[PDB]
Amino acid sequence: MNVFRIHGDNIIECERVIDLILSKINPQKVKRGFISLSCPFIEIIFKEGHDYFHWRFDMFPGFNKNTNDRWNSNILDLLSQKGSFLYETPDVIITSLNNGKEEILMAIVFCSALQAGNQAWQRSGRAYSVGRTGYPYIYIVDFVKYELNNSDRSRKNLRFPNPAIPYSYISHSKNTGNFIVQAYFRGEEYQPKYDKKLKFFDETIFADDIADYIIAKLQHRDTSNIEQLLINKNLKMVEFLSKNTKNDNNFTYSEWESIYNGTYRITNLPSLGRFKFRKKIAEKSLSGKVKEFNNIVQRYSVGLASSDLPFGVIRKESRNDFINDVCKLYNINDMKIIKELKEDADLIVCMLKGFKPRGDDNRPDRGALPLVAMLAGENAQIFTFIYGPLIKGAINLIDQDINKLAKRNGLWKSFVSLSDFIVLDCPIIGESYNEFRLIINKNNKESILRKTSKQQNILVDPTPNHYQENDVDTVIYSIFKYIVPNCFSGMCNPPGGDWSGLSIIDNVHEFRWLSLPRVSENGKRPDHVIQILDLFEKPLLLSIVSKEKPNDLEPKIGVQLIKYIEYLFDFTPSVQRKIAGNWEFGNKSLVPNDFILLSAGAFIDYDNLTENDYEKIFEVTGCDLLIAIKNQNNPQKWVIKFKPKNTIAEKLVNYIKLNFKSNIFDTGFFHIEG
DNA sequence: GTCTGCATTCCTC
DNA sequence: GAGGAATGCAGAC
Ligand SMILES: [Cl-]
C-alpha cells in the first residue's frame, strides 16, 4: 500500500485534489472514514490493466499559523527549509509517506478567476517563494468567471491580467529549474459565442493534463513530457493575451517568444527602448521630491514588458547618469555610497507607494518585487523606490534594524528580501515634511537568499492541539456530503453549495450561481448549502454556518443565511446545464416557494449547554437547527447532538438519523445522540 | 491595537 | 475606455 497526505487550508481544498484524481482513476473499491478525529481519509483500489494499486489519502485540514498552533509540527517548514522565506501558504500540499517521514510532491493553489490589474500579482510572493524550493508549484485557475455588480448580479466586462503575469511562471521555472506553472480549467462561464473578447482564445490552452500530472507524480513516474505540455499551454495563454494588447507600450508575442526560446534575455531585447518605463502616480500621492525622481527615471529608463507596469530598467550604459541625477536630487555626497550605486550592471527600478494614507501597507505591493524576481531573476539588481506615508514606528525601525520590520510585516519582508537598494521619500504621519533614506541592502538581500530554516524531518501527528472551526467544518462536510447522501466524490448526487458557488438541481437541470459575495444587504454567505429532495414534497435547502464555539454564532446568523438564499433567488442563475447532456448561461429564474429553506449553526460544545442556554442560542441566532459536536478520545469518536428549533427541523433530524448509513463511509467513527 | 486575505473604486494616460 | 494605482473591510490573533 502507498500512503499520501493532503494538507489543505480546509476539507473542501483537500477534496478538490481527490476529485482531480478520481476524474482519471476509476476505482474498483473505495472506502472513506477517519484515521483521527481531524483527519479524514479516502482509500482506493484501482488497476492499470493487470497492475493493481492500493492508495490511501490522509487529509489534514487547516494549516498552522506557526510551529505548533494547530498541528504538533508544521508541514510548511519543509518549504522554509528549501528557501521559501516569504510567509506564503499554498491551498494544498501533497506528500508521500516513506520511512516515517513526509516528502512534498507538489504545492497547489486554486483560484476561481484569472485576476487582473495589481490583483494579478497581489499573491505572486507564493509562486516566487515556493518556486525557489524545487517543489512543484501548480496554479490552477478557471477561465473565465465574470466579475459582478453585487447589487443586481449583472456581469462586468472581462478584464485580463498583464501578459507578464502568466509569463512570470514560465520565466521562474527556467531560472530555478523547478516546475512552476499556471493551468487553466474551462469555467462554466466560458461562453465564446456571447463575448467578442474570447474570439481568439485557443481552446487547446484548457488543461486531463493536471490529473495526468498528479497521478504520474503519485506513481513516481517521469513527468517531463506532461510538464512540457502544461508549459506550452501557459505560453499559449501569454500568446492570447499579448496579441490582444496594443504593441506600442507592451511586449509583442514575438518579443516574449524570443525570451522564451532563449534568443534574448528580458533585459537585452534588441527592441528594448521602443517604450520607456513610465510609472503612473496619482497627484494625491505626491510629496517631497517624488515627482522629480519620477522625471529622472523616465529620462533614462527602458520599459520591462509594459510601459506602465510599476518597474523598468536603467541599462548599465545609462546608470552613471541616472545615479548622478538621483544623488544631486537627494544630496547624496558620500563617495562610498555613490560607488555602490554606480556598480557597472543593469538596474531594475521598481516604484511603489507601499502604504495607504494611515500608513497601513498595500497588499498588491507585496507581489511586485516577487513578480520582478520571477521575470528577471532574484539576483538582478533591484532599486526599490517607496513614496507612501510611514508611521513613526516604521521609520524608527528602518533607522535601527530593518530586519526587525521585515520579520513582522509581509510587505517589508518582500522589500528587504529582494531589493539591492531601498530608497524612501516618504511623508511621516505626525510630521510636516518627508524623510529621505537610501538603504544599501545588498549584503542583507544576499544573506536572505541563502537562508533556510533548520533541516529536519516532518511527520505531522494526526491529533491537533485542540479541536476548533476547521474540525467542525470537516465533520459537517463529511456528514452531509458522504454519509447522508451516500456519495464518495464531489461529482455526485445534488452538489449543493459552498463559498465558491451554489448549485440547485431539479428533474432535468442543474442551475448554478457563481461569484457569491461574502455578504448581501440582509444576508451572509453560508459555509455549506445542502439540498435534500427525498424528505418533503418540496426540495429542502439547508444552509449551515460552522463556528468553534456556540457564542461565536452571531446575532440573526440563521435569518441572514436564509436571506442570502432569498437574494440569489431574486436573480437568474449564472449558468445551467441538462443533467443528462454542456454549461450555458442561465435562462430561467427559480421560484423560492418551490423550496423549503432551513438554517443551521454547528459548533463544538463539551456538554456546557443547559436547556436555557440552547433556548438563548435559538433566540439570538434564529437558526432552525443547532449541531453540537464533541470528540470522545477513548475510543476516538465524534458525538453529534442535533437540536431542532421547530417541527420541520425535527423531521430533518429524524431523516439524518434514518440515513446515517453507508457502504463507502465508516459511520462507526460517529455517535448520533439524537 | 497589528497583520493578511479579500476584493472594489479611483486616477492617469 | 484600458488597466495600473489606490483604497478599505474583515477575521484572526
Ligand atoms: Cl494566439
Spatial distance between the Cα atoms of A269 and A258, rounded to a whole number of angstroms: 8
> What strands lie across the sheet with A29-34, from one edge to the other?
A29-34, A40-48, A51-61, A2-8, A92-98, A101-111, A137-143, A180-186
Q: Cβ of A391 < 7 Å from strand B?
A: yes
Give me the sign of the Cα torsion angle A97, A98, A100, A105.
negative
Give me the sign of the Cα torsion angle A53, A58, A64, A69.
negative
A499-506: long-range pairs with CB below 8 Å, 24+: A499/A12, A499/A525, A499/A527, A500/A12, A500/A112, A501/A574, A502/A529, A502/A565, A502/A568, A503/A531, A504/A531, A504/A539, A504/A541, A504/A573, A504/A590, A505/A531, A505/A533, A505/A579, A506/A539
Distances (CA, A) of A144 to A70, A102, A147, A182, A373: 36, 36, 10, 14, 27
Spatial distance between the Cα atoms of A323 and A338, rounded to a whole number of angstroms: 8
Q: Cβ of A248 < 7 Å from strand B?
A: no
Spatial distance between the Cα atoms of A20 and A26, rounded to a whole number of angstroms: 11
* 3-class secondary structure, A526: coil
What is the distance between the terminal CA atoms of chain A, rounded to a whole angstrom? 38
Longest dimension (CA), chain A: 86
Tell me, in angstroms, the distance from the centre of ligand 1 to residue A202's CA: 7
Q: Which three cell numbers stand for residue A239?
A: 500568446
Q: What amino acid occupies position A72? A: N
H or E element, residue A478: helix A469-478
Tell me, in angstroms, the distance from the centre of ligand 1 to residue A454's CA: 46
Q: Cβ of A147 < 7 Å from strand B?
A: yes
Q: Which nucleotides of B are covered by protein (CB under 7 A)?
A: 2-13
Beta-carbon contacts of residue A368 (< 8 Å; ≥ 6 apart): A118, A121, A124, A310, A311, A350, A352, A414
Distance from chain centroid for Cα A643: 35
Beta-carbon contacts of residue A184 (< 8 Å; ≥ 6 apart): A114, A140, A141, A142, A143, A205, A206, A207, A233, A237
If you measure CA to C1', which residue is closest to nucleotide B13?
A280
If you measure CA to C1', which residue is closest to nucleotide C10?
A518
Tell me, in angstroms, the distance from the centre of ligand 1 to residue A240's CA: 4
Spatial distance between the Cα atoms of A50 and A1, rounded to a whole number of angstroms: 16
Q: Cβ of A246 < 7 Å from strand B?
A: no
Q: Which three cell numbers stand for residue A205?
A: 490552452
Residue in the block written with cell 516577487: A370
- Residue A661 · residue A667 · CB < 8 Å: yes
Distances (CA, A) of A223 to A105, A127, A577: 12, 20, 35
Beta-carbon contacts of residue A225 (< 8 Å; ≥ 6 apart): none
What's the half-sphere exposure (Cβ side, CA atoms, 13 Å) at A229?
A: 12
DSSP for A65-122, please give it. SSSSSSSSS-TTHHHHTTT--S----SEEEEEEETTEEEEEEEEEEESS---GGGGTT
If you measure CA to C1', which residue is closest to nucleotide B6?
A518
A322: left (phi over 0), alpha (psi -120 to 50) or beta: alpha
Nominal resolution in Å? 1.8
CA nearest to A128, candidates A164, A92, A162, A176? A176
Spatial distance between the Cα atoms of A101 and A81, rounded to a whole number of angstroms: 15
Tell me, in angstroms, the distance from the centre of ligand 1 to residue A175's CA: 25
Which stretches of A145-208 are assigned E, i.e. beta strand? 148-149, 154-155, 180-186
Distances (CA, A) of A486 to A32, A483, A661: 11, 5, 8
Spatial distance between the Cα atoms of A53 and A70, rounded to a whole number of angstroms: 33
Spatial distance between the Cα atoms of A318 and A301, rounded to a whole number of angstroms: 8
- Pairing type for strands A625-633 and A596-604 reads parallel
Tell me, in angstroms, the distance from the centre of ligand 1 to residue A233's CA: 11
Spatial distance between the Cα atoms of A129 and A81, rounded to a whole number of angstroms: 12
- Residue A189 · residue A197 · CB < 8 Å: no
CA of A413, C1' of B3: distance in angstroms: 13
CA of A54, C1' of B4: distance in angstroms: 40
* 3-class secondary structure, A397: helix
Strand C proximity list, CB < 7 Å: A 65, 69, 116-120, 157, 159-162, 245-246, 279-282, 284-285, 306, 308-310, 351-353, 356-358, 360, 362-364, 388, 469, 518
Q: Burial letters for A555-584: b for 16+ Cβ neighbours within 10 Å, e otherwise?
A: eebbbbbbbbbebbbeeebbbbbeeeeebe
CA of A359, C1' of B1: distance in angstroms: 14
Give me the sign of the Cα torsion angle A68, A71, A72, A75.
negative
DSSP for A353-387, please give it. --B-TTSPBPSGGGGHHHHHHHHH-TTS-EEEEE-
Tell me, in angstroms, the distance from the centre of ligand 1 to residue A269's CA: 21
Tell me, in angstroms, the distance from the centre of ligand 1 to residue A252's CA: 11
Tell me, in angstroms, the distance from the centre of ligand 1 to residue A239's CA: 5
- Pairing type for strands A540-546 and A347-352 reads unpaired
- Pairing type for strands A584-585 and A435-440 reads unpaired
- Residue A573 · residue A590 · CB < 8 Å: yes
Residue A219 is given by DSSP the state: T
Spatial distance between the Cα atoms of A602 and A476, rounded to a whole number of angstroms: 8
Beta-carbon contacts of residue A271 (< 8 Å; ≥ 6 apart): A255
A301: left (phi over 0), alpha (psi -120 to 50) or beta: beta
Beta-carbon contacts of residue A223 (< 8 Å; ≥ 6 apart): A179, A213, A216, A217
Q: Which three cell numbers stand for residue A211?
A: 490529473
If you measure CA to C1', which residue is closest to nucleotide B10?
A282
Distances (CA, A) of A296 to A241, A271, A277, A333, A426: 31, 22, 11, 18, 18
Beta-carbon contacts of residue A196 (< 8 Å; ≥ 6 apart): none
CA of A436, C1' of B3: distance in angstroms: 26
Q: Which nucleotide is nearest to A515 (CA to C1')?
A: B7
Q: Which residues pair with A7 in a beta bridge?
A: A60, A93
CA of A201, C1' of B6: distance in angstroms: 29
Tell me, in angstroms, the distance from the centre of ligand 1 to residue A241's CA: 8
Q: Burial letters for A51-70: b for 16+ Cβ neighbours within 10 Å, e otherwise?
A: eebebbbbbbbbbbeeeeeb
Q: Cβ of A89 < 7 Å from strand B?
A: yes
Beta-carbon contacts of residue A144 (< 8 Å; ≥ 6 apart): A113, A114, A158, A187, A189, A190, A198
SS3 of A439-450: EECHHHHHHHHH
Give me the sign of the Cα torsion angle A354, A360, A363, A364.
negative
- Residue A655 · residue A535 · CB < 8 Å: yes
Spatial distance between the Cα atoms of A115 and A614, rounded to a whole number of angstroms: 44
Tell me, in angstroms, the distance from the centre of ligand 1 to residue A575's CA: 27
CA nearest to A497, candidates A528, A471, A457? A528
- Residue A176 · residue A130 · CB < 8 Å: no
Q: How many other CB atoms are there within 10 angstroms of residue A594's CB atom?
A: 11
Which stretches of A499-583 are assigned E, i.e. beta strand? 501-505, 509-514, 528-532, 540-546, 575-578
Residue A426 is given by DSSP the state: E
Spatial distance between the Cα atoms of A273 and A307, rounded to a whole number of angstroms: 10
Give rounded-to-5 percent helix, strand, coil for chain A: 35, 25, 40
Q: Which three cell numbers stand for residue A290?
A: 517624488
- Residue A371 · residue A130 · CB < 8 Å: no
- Residue A318 · residue A259 · CB < 8 Å: no
Beta-carbon contacts of residue A242 (< 8 Å; ≥ 6 apart): A163, A250, A251, A252, A253, A256
CA of A503, C1' of B6: distance in angstroms: 23
Q: Which nucleotide is nearest to A91 (CA to C1')?
A: B5
Spatial distance between the Cα atoms of A27 and A47, rounded to a whole number of angstroms: 7
> Which residue blocks in A184-245 are alpha helix, DSSP H?
209-218, 224-242
Q: Which three cell numbers stand for residue A289?
A: 521630491
Residue in the block written with cell 500512503: A3
Spatial distance between the Cα atoms of A81 and A324, rounded to a whole number of angstroms: 41
Q: Cβ of A408 < 7 Å from strand B?
A: yes
- Residue A278 · residue A298 · CB < 8 Å: yes
Q: Burial of A545 by CB count in 10 Å (0-12 exposed, 13-18 middle, 19+ buried)?
A: buried
Tell me, in angstroms, the distance from the centre of ligand 1 to residue A236's CA: 6
Q: Which three cell numbers stand for residue A304?
A: 520591462
Q: Which nucleotide is nearest to A244 (CA to C1')?
A: C2
Q: Which nucleotide is nearest to A284 (CA to C1')?
A: B11
Q: Which nucleotides of C are covered by protein (CB under 7 A)?
A: 2-10, 12-13
Q: Which nucleotide is nearest to A517 (CA to C1')?
A: B7
Q: Burial of A45 by CB count in 10 Å (0-12 exposed, 13-18 middle, 19+ buried)?
A: middle
Q: Cβ of A175 < 7 Å from strand B?
A: no
Q: Burial letters for A184-194: b for 16+ Cβ neighbours within 10 Å, e otherwise?
A: beebbbbeeee
Distances (CA, A) of A151 to A52, A466, A519, A568, A664: 54, 40, 11, 11, 43
* 3-class secondary structure, A34: strand
Q: How many other CB atoms are there within 10 angstroms of residue A411's CB atom?
A: 24
Spatial distance between the Cα atoms of A533 and A108, rounded to a whole number of angstroms: 35
Q: Cβ of A364 < 7 Å from strand B?
A: yes
* 3-class secondary structure, A58: strand
Tell me, in angstroms, the distance from the centre of ligand 1 to residue A200's CA: 6
Cis before A40? omega within 30: no
CA of A409, C1' of B2: distance in angstroms: 9
Give me the sign of the Cα torsion angle A616, A621, A622, A627.
negative
Beta-carbon contacts of residue A433 (< 8 Å; ≥ 6 apart): A288, A427
Q: Which three cell numbers stand for residue A577?
A: 446545464
Q: What amino acid occupies position A488? A: F
Spatial distance between the Cα atoms of A658 and A253, rounded to a whole number of angstroms: 61
Q: Cβ of A111 < 7 Å from strand B?
A: no
Beta-carbon contacts of residue A343 (< 8 Å; ≥ 6 apart): A319, A381
